[PDB]
Amino acid sequence: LGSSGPSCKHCKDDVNRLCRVCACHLCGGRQDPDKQLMCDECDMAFHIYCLDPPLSSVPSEDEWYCPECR
């Protein structure tokens, strides 16, 4: 993966692994990247359906903070 190597140190950009660092911080699942919100503080991803309560869709706000950060 070149000079910088993998973007993610934890999974090494292996798409066949679950990863709670570069994919959903709750379940590690890579599916539905379009429904994973990025926290504007910690930059972790979260499936709308992994949150509690689950969100139906992507919020229409300027920013979003995850449960760990908010």
Binding site: S7, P33, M38, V58, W64
Partner: peptide, 25 residues
């Protein structure tokens, strides 16, 4: 609100520019 997909697409776009297909020697 950014999604993981939007982040992945940004990265793909940047990489695409690096190919430099539009350059002759």
């Amino acid at each position: 609100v950014r999604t993981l997909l939007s982040v992945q697409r940004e990265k793909m776009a940047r990489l695409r520019y690096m190919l430099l297909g539009g350059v002759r020697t």
